[PDB]
Amino acid sequence: STGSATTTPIDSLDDAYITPVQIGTPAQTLNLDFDTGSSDLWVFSSETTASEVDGQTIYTPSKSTTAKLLSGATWSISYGDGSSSSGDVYTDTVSVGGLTVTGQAVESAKKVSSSFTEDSTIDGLLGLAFSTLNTVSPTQQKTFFDNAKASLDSPVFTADLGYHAPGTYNFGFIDTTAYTGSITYTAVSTKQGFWEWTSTGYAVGSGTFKSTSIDGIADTGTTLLYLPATVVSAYWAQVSGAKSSSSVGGYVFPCSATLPSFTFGVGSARIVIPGDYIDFGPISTGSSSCFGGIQSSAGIGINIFGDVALKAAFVVFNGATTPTLGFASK
Template identity: 50%
Template structure:
């Protein structure tokens, strides 16, 4: 009897032990790149919030959101406004959504934006210039100097006009992953001189540098982060071709602001030097932003190194940046004319290292599976199919700005004569287009409508979506129908990655488009190259 009870007890304990849940561990694997192995960590289970993506993009460019009829976007707290694209009239009708409980958080955020719009008109205005307070040059007084940075304003800097692109003067070397060739095109003789930036220290490696880092999707693809080493400290930064500041979370922030971020500590870097009297301030139309002091340090991106790179150390950040726990800051890769450092703008990492690279280029090959990369100084032919097609860039805007005068829906082309110029922006999640293009696309989707609770177009997740393509110069950059959806709003409703720019004067070609293509940014010839990404 006792033996039987003992056996039953042992069996019971074994069953409980086997059924007990094991601790969750990060899913890891490795990506073999050339002669070395890079660890990769994937995050799972995060559902992207469409309102966050829309808000982030609109904050960045200081835009005011509007509904399809042109009126300011005002969130509806109970019954979302929808625009029926398939009826004879475009007048909004109020409907009750079955997804209200799931969209509650989005509506709270929408209400906040509505209040900001009503109170502040949600418009971007460059602050009036003010004298920057000189910061002591020693590391010991770095924190004391940080408080002076909050009152600094963004210094306005005139955009530099460059010589017109000439295809005859442009040459590129496409390399395999085995080696990099160095054929750089000389700058045009009539090119305008560069602004008077502080000069970086030259690289000791000559003009054959290359660098490569993984672009790991965070928040299920809402942004892509890459490891950057600054003064020996590793940070995960968002590479942003739509801005020109390299700014990071710093130890001068409060512990609450730092939270889960990795923060750069200048006192732990033997190569850090404060840039006396310089500050930075990035402010957006909804009140979010970052401000701080400026210094120099060694920055290494996958082997491409600048030994005296201007870095902007945040001493104050808004809650919007604090809540993005994955990103420790940004690497701006637009043209240096957009840099916000005052009183003297600084060069971007790419502008500083471009003359030291094997080729004056960097490339983006983004991928949701975590195998995407950014590369500096080389064009890897194994990452795209077909031929690269190059398009001249209007660098005077400060952006990688191109013409886009055509789009295609389900294989049907439509030419445009009044299209807004477009910028290639790896720092924006969505594809933001002129309103008439967006309305034309969703008119082909029976269940599509404009939903005021998320500020964009939604549709039944069961829909079979048409392919979409948009011109980058003469190159038609396509998105398969399966790649249009950005995120689910609920179990039945999905939010499209193609959304309106609310009639602004720029179209933004973000990651929803770019992750399907291999993109070359040539800073010397000022051209963009694109081809279909290899699968």
């Protein structure tokens, strides 16, 4: 089997991407944030504290003839941005782009933190990291991909995120029309439960490539590119007037700037992030200070190849017995 679904930016900045997901019988379609940096499929629901729902579409398990309470199971998750959610668990039928999993754990939110409430466009998350990170207790649950894998034509999914445009998540096949040149594959460590890999270096604009190992995760659920402070300083030094602002919470730059590109290495191959992808717009409405899309990972404890990086590539998440990651230009 295979599946193919379109993923759409939630706003004009590509802050996140939503993909329609069918849950239950009859189908209830929710728009979920596919997140290769976590491993829980959770939704706003009929159980979510009413004051914490503001415009989201909810899953109502009592209206699904295939929903079953997973008795005794609870979940609770906290994300890198400080947001969180928690609740109980159902199993139900879940389909993405024509690919169906029966008995998928659907984690129903009883509580969500303010950032989730405030984002009316995201109805929940669909985790695509390794199932070892799943938070369900006392019986850990599998991701949608893990459940689908054996049925797939090939044990893979691909992320093809758009810049200010829709893109695609495919399951079970590699669309050879969706990228240019060849796909370069690189080793993955699953030791921390992430799609963790080592970039071979970087360049800023038309500058020379610096060969240096940068361990990090491929994370579709993180907006920005978070890299070591040395790398980030080298990038922003090429933008007149750019500076790190403690008050804002990162590097800002004059909105009148033209940003240089940023290149990262994948083996001997190179992925180029155009400068425009690094512009996240005014820090506050009407400001002439703009927020940068490349930020320091210092104090996160890990480097994160988030959407800024991933949307410059066609990315293969290869879930073979020994997982790997592939990157192609597009």
